[PDB]
């Protein structure tokens, strides 16, 4: 199942190495494995019509909950997922892992899942046709605790990472058999196009929900973009 794919990915990432400016690496697939597997098992049953793909976790989302775009509030309240989360070895004090006790809200996840809930009401109606997964489960931090996107990695270190993640995504698409794969943001979409070349699947994009990315009407834009891709939302 999905759990096997995630475990395989984590194992593949276990051997990886990253150089300066990278100083801290979080792998929520390890320290937040139980809620992650809960998500996969409860909401990831094949087949899916559409797959949403995020690039990498935010510090207050999946890095805390193990759930893609997993803002604590919406994960506990709507997905009904709680669970034990331990701390990563290379934890930075400016981005501490409090798990479901974390009091900061990940805006991207709050917005995305808030939107999904707005459209579908219950998780069952959404996951009947859709799923959301994370391309790269690793969080990268500077010595000062600043975020580093996978984009800004050394090519020699970036290539195997993207290799493992491409593998994971391919296995994911094979299992869930979606007709459309939608990257959340440009980076995710690029990764989807490259990783899934050769697949009989349409690769698309919706605007990234981050305020830091970004017009005044993200939800309307994404709804429109979904309309263009021929997916009823």
CA pair distance 224, 218, nearest whole angstrom: 10
Question: 185, 213 in Cβ contact below 8 A?
Answer: yes
Q: Are 131 and 44 in contact (CB under 8 A)?
A: yes
> What tokens does 169 get?
């995504």
As a whole number of angstroms, the distance between CA 190 and CA 29 comes to 23
Residue 55 annotated as part of some ligand binding site = yes
Q: Is 106 annotated as a binding residue?
A: yes
Cβ-in-10-Å burial (0-12, 13-18, 19+) of 4 comes to exposed
Q: How was this structure determined?
A: X-ray
Rounded to the nearest 5 percent, the helix, strand and coil shares of the chain are: 45, 10, 40
Phi/psi-derived region of residue 16, left when phi > 0, alpha when psi is between -120 and 50, beta in every other case: beta
Q: Which residues contact 65 (CB under 8 A, 6 or more apart)?
A: 28, 32, 35, 71, 72, 75, 81, 85, 99, 100
Domain that holds residue 86: 1-233
**Could you give the angle at the alpha carbon of 125 between the alpha carbons of 215 and 132, nearest 5°?**
50
- Coil vs helix vs strand at 37: helix
Q: How far is 57 from 140, CA to CA, in rounded Å?
A: 9
Beta carbons of 136 and 56 less than 8 angstroms apart: yes
Question: Contact at 8 Å (CB) between 75 and 66?
Answer: no
Cis preceding-peptide flag for 21 (omega within 30 of 0): yes
- Residue by residue, DSSP assigns 62-125 as HHHHSSTT--HHHHHHTS------PPPTT--GGG---GGG-----HHHHHHHHHHHHHHSSHHH
Number of domains in the chain: 1
Is 92 known as a binding-site position? no
Q: How many helices (H) and strands (E) does the chain have?
A: 10, 6
Q: How far apart are CA 187 and CA 88, in angstroms?
A: 26
Residue 97 near residue 31, CB atoms below 8 Å: yes
The answer to whether 24 is annotated as binding is no
Was 62 annotated as part of a binding site? no
Tell me, what DSSP letter sits at residue 196?
A: T
User: Resolution limit in angstroms?
Assistant: 2.2
CATH code, 158: 3.40.470.10
Binding residue per annotation — 208?
yes
Tell me the CA distances in angstroms from 77 to 46, 127, 129, one per residue in order: 24, 16, 21
DSSP 8-state assignment for residue 20: T
């Amino acid at each position: 199942g999905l759990a096997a794919i995630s475990d395989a990915l984590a194992a593949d990432l276990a051997g990886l190495s990253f150089s300066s400016p990278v100083a801290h690496v979080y792998n929520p697939l390890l320290y937040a494995r139980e809620p992650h597997v809960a998500y996969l098992s409860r909401f990831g049953s094949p087949p899916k019509e559409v797959l949403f793909v995020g690039m990498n976790p935010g510090p207050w989302g999946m890095a805390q909950t193990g759930v893609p775009f997993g803002e604590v509030a919406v994960v506990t309240e709507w997905l009904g997922i709680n669970g034990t989360v331990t701390r990563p070895a290379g934890e930075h004090p400016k981005k501490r892992v409090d798990g479901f006790a974390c009091r900061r809200s990940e805006v991207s996840g709050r917005r995305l899942w808030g939107f999904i809930r707005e459209r579908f009401g219950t998780p069952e109606r959404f996951f009947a046709r859709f799923f959301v997964a994370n391309y790269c489960p690793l969080l990268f931090l500077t010595a000062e605790g600043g975020n580093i996107t996978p984009d800004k990695l050394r090519r020699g270190e970036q290539e195997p990472l993207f290799a493992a993640c491409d593998l994971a995504l391919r296995r994911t698409v094979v299992l869930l058999r979606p007709r459309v794969v939608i990257g959340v943001g440009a980076f995710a979409e690029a990764r989807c196009h490259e990783a899934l070349e050769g697949f009989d699947v349409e690769v698309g994009r919706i605007i990234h929900p981050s305020p830091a990315s970004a017009n005044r009407d993200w939800a309307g834009t994404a709804l429109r973009q979904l309309a263009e891709l021929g997916v009823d939302f």
